[PDB]
Amino acid sequence: PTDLERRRAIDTAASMYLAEEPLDMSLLAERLGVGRATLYRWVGNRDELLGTVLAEATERTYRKAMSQASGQGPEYILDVFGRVMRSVESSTELRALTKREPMVFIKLAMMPGSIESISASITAEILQSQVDAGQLTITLSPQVLGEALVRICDVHLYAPLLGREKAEIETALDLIALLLGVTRNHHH
Ligand SMILES: [Ca+2]
């Protein structure tokens, strides 16, 4: 596809996600005015397209948290992650998707793919900017630490899909702190 053809496809698929409608590839092809074969050629299967849709929504979440987060260094990184995780936890569109297709979502979110790659590359960028600002001391590359932060956190954010009671945000933050070489002094 052209960048434009793919954009129309993702934008339409994203509206279905936001409207809490399942990603019906036939409904999508009809809305685009294209055949099912043309649609597959443009975006791949339903899972590949949903991953792209969710990865773009993930980027928007991260960017908003980065502009709204306070402080510098590990305290800023902790704030961005806390904000992103709580925003994801309160998502009604995600909630509707996870209730209907938990196994598809576990795969898209917690297996290497679209969601983990954008989360890791935006985290890597956050780490590099903090190192560039003289606010963070790291021994491993931002790419290595960014991927590690995402991998350690995501199973906690999505803990109810894995058989647990609730999103384990505080535990994920404790792991980020430990990875950054800082302490979290909990009370109450
Ligand atoms: Ca184009």
Author numbering: 2 to 189
Task: Please quote the paper that reports this structure.
In R. erythropolis, the lactonase QsdA has been identified as the only lactonase. QsdR protein possesses a DNA-binding domain at the N-terminus and a regulatory domain at the C-terminus. The DNA-binding domain permits the protein to bind DNA inducing genes activation or repression under its control.
Thus the structure of QsdR at 2.4 Å resolution was solved using sulfur SAD method. A better resolution structure at 1.9 Å of QsdR from a different crystallization condition was determined by molecular replacement (using the sulfur-SAD structure as model) with two identical molecules in the asymmetric unit (root mean square deviation (rmsd) of 0.07 Å for 181 Cα atoms). These two domains are connected by two residues, Glycine 45 and Asparagine 46. Each monomer in the asymmetric unit forms a dimer by the crystallographic symmetry. The dimer interface covers 995 A2 per subunit involving 19 residues located in helices α7, α 9 and α10 and two loops, one between α7 and α8 and the other between α9 and α10.
